[PDB]
Amino acid sequence: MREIVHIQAGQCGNQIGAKFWEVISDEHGIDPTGSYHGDSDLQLERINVYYNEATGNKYVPRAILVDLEPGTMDSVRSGPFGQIFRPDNFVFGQSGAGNNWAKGHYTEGAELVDSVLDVVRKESESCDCLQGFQLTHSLGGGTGSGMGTLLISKIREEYPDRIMNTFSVMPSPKVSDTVVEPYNATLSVHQLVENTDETYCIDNEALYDICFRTLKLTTPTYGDLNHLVSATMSGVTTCLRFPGQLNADLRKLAVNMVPFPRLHFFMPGFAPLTSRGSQQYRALTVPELTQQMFDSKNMMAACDPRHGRYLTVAAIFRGRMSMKEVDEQMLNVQNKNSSYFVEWIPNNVKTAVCDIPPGLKMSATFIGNSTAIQELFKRISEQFTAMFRRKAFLHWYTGEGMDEMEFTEAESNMNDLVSEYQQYQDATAD
Amino acid sequence: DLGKKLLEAARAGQDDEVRILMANGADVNATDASGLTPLHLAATYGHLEIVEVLLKHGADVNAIDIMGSTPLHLAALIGHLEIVEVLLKHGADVNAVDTWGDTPLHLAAIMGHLEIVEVLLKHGADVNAQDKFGKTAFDISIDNGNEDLAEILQK
Amino acid sequence: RECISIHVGQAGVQIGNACWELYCLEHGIQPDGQMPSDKTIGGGDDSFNTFFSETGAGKHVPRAVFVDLEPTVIDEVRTGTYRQLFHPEQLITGKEDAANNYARGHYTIGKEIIDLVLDRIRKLADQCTGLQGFLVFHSFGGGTGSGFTSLLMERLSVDYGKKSKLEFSIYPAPQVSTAVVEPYNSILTTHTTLEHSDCAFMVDNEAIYDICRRNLDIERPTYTNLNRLISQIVSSITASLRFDGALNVDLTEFQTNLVPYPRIHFPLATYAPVISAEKAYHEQLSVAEITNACFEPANQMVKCDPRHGKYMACCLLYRGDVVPKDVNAAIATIKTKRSIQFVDWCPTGFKVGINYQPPTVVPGGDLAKVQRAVCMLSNTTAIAEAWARLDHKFDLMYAKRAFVHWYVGEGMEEGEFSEAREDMAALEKDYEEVG
Ligand SMILES: Nc1nc2c(ncn2[C@@H]2O[C@H](COP(=O)(O)OP(=O)(O)OP(=O)(O)O)[C@@H](O)[C@H]2O)c(=O)[nH]1
Ligand SMILES: Nc1nc2c(ncn2[C@@H]2O[C@H](COP(=O)(O)OP(=O)(O)O)[C@@H](O)[C@H]2O)c(=O)[nH]1
Numbered sequence A: 001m002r003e004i005v006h007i008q009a010g011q012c013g014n015q016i017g018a019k020f021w022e023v024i025s026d027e028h029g030i031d032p033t034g035s036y037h038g039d040s041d042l043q044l045e046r047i048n049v050y051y052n053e054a055t056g057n058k059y060v061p062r063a064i065l066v067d068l069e070p071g072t073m074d075s076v077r078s079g080p081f082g083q084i085f086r087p088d089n090f091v092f093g094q095s096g097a098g099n100n101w102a103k104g105h106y107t108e109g110a111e112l113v114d115s116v117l118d119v120v121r122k123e124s125e126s127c128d129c130l131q132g133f134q135l136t137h138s139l140g141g142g143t144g145s146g147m148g149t150l151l152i153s154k155i156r157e158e159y160p161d162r163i164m165n166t167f168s169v170m171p172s173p174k175v176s177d178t179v180v181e182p183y184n185a186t187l188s189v190h191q192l193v194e195n196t197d198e199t200y201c202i203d204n205e206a207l208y209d210i211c212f213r214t215l216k217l218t219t220p221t222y223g224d225l226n227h228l229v230s231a232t233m234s235g236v237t238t239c240l241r242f243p244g245q246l247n248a249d250l251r252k253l254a255v256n257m258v259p260f261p262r263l264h265f266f267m268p269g270f271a272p273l274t275s276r277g278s279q280q281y282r283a284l285t286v287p288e289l290t291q292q293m294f295d296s297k298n299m300m301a302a303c304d305p306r307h308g309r310y311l312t313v314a315a316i317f318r319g320r321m322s323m324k325e326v327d328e329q330m331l332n333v334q335n336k337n338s339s340y341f342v343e344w345i346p347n348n349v350k351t352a353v354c355d356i357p358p359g360l361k362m363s364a365t366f367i368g369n370s371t372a373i374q375e376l377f378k379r380i381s382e383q384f385t386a387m388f389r390r391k392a393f394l395h396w397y398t399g400e401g402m403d404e405m406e407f408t409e410a411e412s413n414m415n416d417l418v419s420e421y422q423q424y425q426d427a428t429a430d
Numbered sequence B: 001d002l003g004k005k006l007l008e009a010a011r012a013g014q015d016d017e018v019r020i021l022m023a024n025g026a027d028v029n030a031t032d033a034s035g036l037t038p039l040h041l042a043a044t045y046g047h048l049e050i051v052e053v054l055l056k057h058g059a060d061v062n063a064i065d066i067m068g069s070t071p072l073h074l075a076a077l078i079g080h081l082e083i084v085e086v087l088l089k090h091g092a093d094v095n096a097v098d099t100w101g102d103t104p105l106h107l108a109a110i111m112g113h114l115e116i117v118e119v120l121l122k123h124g125a126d127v128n129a130q131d132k133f134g135k136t137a138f139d140i141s142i143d144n145g146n147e148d149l150a151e152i153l154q155k
Numbered sequence C: 001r002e003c004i005s006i007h008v009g010q011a012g013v014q015i016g017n018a019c020w021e022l023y024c025l026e027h028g029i030q031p032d033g034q035m036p037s038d039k040t041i042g043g044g045d046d047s048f049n050t051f052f053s054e055t056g057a058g059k060h061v062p063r064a065v066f067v068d069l070e071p072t073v074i075d076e077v078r079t080g081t082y083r084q085l086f087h088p089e090q091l092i093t094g095k096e097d098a099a100n101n102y103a104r105g106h107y108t109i110g111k112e113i114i115d116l117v118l119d120r121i122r123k124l125a126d127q128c129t130g131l132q133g134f135l136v137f138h139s140f141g142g143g144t145g146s147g148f149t150s151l152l153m154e155r156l157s158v159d160y161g162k163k164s165k166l167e168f169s170i171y172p173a174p175q176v177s178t179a180v181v182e183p184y185n186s187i188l189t190t191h192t193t194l195e196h197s198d199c200a201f202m203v204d205n206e207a208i209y210d211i212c213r214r215n216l217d218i219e220r221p222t223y224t225n226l227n228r229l230i231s232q233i234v235s236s237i238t239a240s241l242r243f244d245g246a247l248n249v250d251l252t253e254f255q256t257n258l259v260p261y262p263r264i265h266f267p268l269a270t271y272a273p274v275i276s277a278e279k280a281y282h283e284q285l286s287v288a289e290i291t292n293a294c295f296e297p298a299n300q301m302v303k304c305d306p307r308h309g310k311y312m313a314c315c316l317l318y319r320g321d322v323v324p325k326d327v328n329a330a331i332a333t334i335k336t337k338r339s340i341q342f343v344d345w346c347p348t349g350f351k352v353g354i355n356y357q358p359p360t361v362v363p364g365g366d367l368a369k370v371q372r373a374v375c376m377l378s379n380t381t382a383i384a385e386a387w388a389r390l391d392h393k394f395d396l397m398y399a400k401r402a403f404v405h406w407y408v409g410e411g412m413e414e415g416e417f418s419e420a421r422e423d424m425a426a427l428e429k430d431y432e433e434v435g
């Protein structure tokens, strides 16, 4: 279990994907050209997880960039580490999907999906021990959501024994007041419930709230949002890419984080919260990181964990600090907040320390499988239902070949998902 | 049947085709099978100029389709602020209730159209109106943790 | 008669690495396999030959197989201080581990390598003039340690029916855990191995952890600290196999002395004294003191209270400056003074073995040298408390079928969970019935 094939689809997907490769390249000593300038070796022990060692001690992101809109390929390349990606790995269409999931999933995107698979095959066949896939995509658009989930389903068929992991950006009208996005998200969530083993729910609602209410950014930009994402993405993958006392792979994470196949939507949380540039170098104490990483204001999904129960939690502390302190502080949070963890999953909190920090001195990254995430799904379900009851814009979808019944089936599967979450939130040991 | 053509022209945003059909006797208040009028469609698809023109030609600003949706419902759902205001200025019932008990305030709130929320409130939207499940727009804001909305609704 | 040690998965390999290091130091075998005190060069019949074969070059080779489904832990043996000690072909690695999933270790991934492991074991067996059987080291909580081990034991029973199979099993503790599903792996492997194992020494990671923190003043014990304490205990248990002695001199005698009935085959190991190496000038504890310490629950390899149980067997294995009459006197003052209650059907007696060589300290270890030490092996019904704790964690999750989908997706029938759990319930009853 070593190589992860990363795929980024659509404008959001490519945009946060590029940000991810910047942040982790930097963390691994890699530069915009592939050359390792790291001052510590463990930055390369686990480098093979996200990078193919090419020629010249060159490290190339094992990254496939996909989009039905040719435009984003250029913005990707104009990027800092935009020249680091294999030119053969840019699979781009010509028209785009126009926020229409059905175009991404059934027509335009189905045209391009075979081109993407070929590259996936190439990158997979050159893998010593492929552990699975990581896709970055928005759910609110057409390509990331519609083609992304088609891309997930196709990969799944060909690589059924590999882990499928997504970083899925949930839509929010606070960030994009496009009213078909609930449709796209709901159709996508129906796909993600069945075809992904692990989905990090990255919620634009939460990202906006953090920037606006906490970081006091009055007009948050995608760049501000994506700073939270990339910090989150670096955090949650720390232990895929750094040795540590844990030999973490995507499957051991899944086995310990997913008690029920459909409840694989994780709420990530991060501490400390910072704006771009912000000289917030005040540091933070273990007890502070531990508390904050467990606060609704630090969650990347607009969910109050205190409204549900934590089925499983994995926390990655990063930096110099007494693993004995983190052991004590983490026990502390678990006993003071006992009623927010299910009692029928013993020892459901897992903690790792990792010496290398992200660009701060201390971070905590939280990965919660919390029943409170039903709040996110309920928010989207309600918007979906508002639109769908009036059949607004349904013709955009049915005219691409989608059946109206796919909408009702998505909505039902999402409502079922929320009920499952409530079921385990209310279950007791006795 | 110019009525059927007006409906399509209204949906499609063809201003000139609307003007022509009206001038040839097209039923401004024609209805598709769902009871949608040209004004419903223009309000849904964001055709502000068609909305204004229909309203100067006898459009019933408060027409309801089979599900009780008024044009203001759809404009509030979809988020067309300018159409919302034009509809209100021509007598749209700010508190019209559809077959789900939804008022335009309910739909603007659910969809996060905060400016529309404010406009509806200034125009007398009933923050105590409950949908069929008992939710007022404020309940929706509290249930969904939409603090921005909930601040607007507390004025 | 030869004993083959098999070390399965990370815990079994890391503990095996620690044991064989200690064995080498105890026997005077250098890391390259050379043993100067060994006068016979071809081979020989000495007691340490139960664990070590000899090549024509004078190399003393562990009769040991290391197996893991991923290679990282075994690669450390391959590159460590004892790289030259082992048959390179007796270090076997797959590519992808069992993901903490009993069913992958046992059904899917484990089947890809099981026949190689058996063929490599057969090669060691064929070098044996009188194979007694196997010592199998493994975790309960790991997918390899649990699932591959049970697969392996199943196969060994078929291919080596008359051979004894002893296990050293690492029992999971929250303080040093690797997975939420470890209670499942533990019940699953226990259920399927119960029939195939003659005697199993459970090492409670929590007990070792607590000893490291309390007796060794180690604030956050790592595996290295744990495994050093464990290897000292394992060495004490297997010493009788490796050295001359009169107690437990072969695998069969272990079952005879410690296992009154086939299923309740889980002896409690207690060890004393455990003294920090920082206390190099520690006062030497007497035979009476260390023997008394064997009835302190704090010195137990498994957390349980033997005051709440009945003993069915008790062996005291002394190592060092131990006068037999002082043992007898200490036993007399424990048979009267302590609440030791044997079952009514068992001789209320202690078997005593004395190896007059004091324990060896590993350089870099946490343990002070001591003049005398004692390992007590007892079969006591109080170890049922350890099963009960495990069974309860299992039940909490299985009640909701948490995580079960992972096992069923890896070739396992859901009914195997209930069968395993019922087998455990019967095991618990087996201990109540005996008392
Ligand atoms: N005492 C001790 N326990 C260990 C050691 N390594 C792992 N464990 C314990 O073993 C359990 C995990 O099983 P492992 O042996 O790591 O796993 P494995 O057998 O390699 O199986 P997979 O990795 O799941 O394929 C946990 O209870 C760990 O605490 C070790 O060196 N010493
Ligand atoms: N956080 C974040 N969200 C984005 C970004 N770009 C688009 N989105 C969100 O993605 C949705 C629109 O889909 P998008 O990915 O742009 O279209 P695609 O090309 O079809 O994948 C909306 O919910 C946007 O808020 C971005 O850079 N960052």
Ligand SMILES: COc1ccc(CCc2nc3cc(OC)c(OC)c(OC)c3s2)cc1O
Pocket: A235, A236, A237, A238, A239, A240, A246, A248, A249, A252, A253, A256, A257, A312, A313, A314, A315, A316, A347, A348, A349, A350, A351, A352, A365, A367, C177, C178, C179, C180
């Ligand atoms: C809930 O209880 C447990 C959870 C998981 C496990 C083992 C597997 C893990 N793999 C990773 C990978 C991680 O990053 C990708 C990561 O955060 C960066 C992790 O958290 C530190 C872990 S934990 C055992 C448990 O007992």
Ligand SMILES: [Ca+2]
Pocket: C038, C039, C040, C041, C042, C043, C044, C045, C046, C054
């Ligand atoms: Ca010899």
Ligand SMILES: [Mg+2]
Pocket: C009, C010, C068, C070, C097, C142, C144
């Ligand atoms: Mg392992």
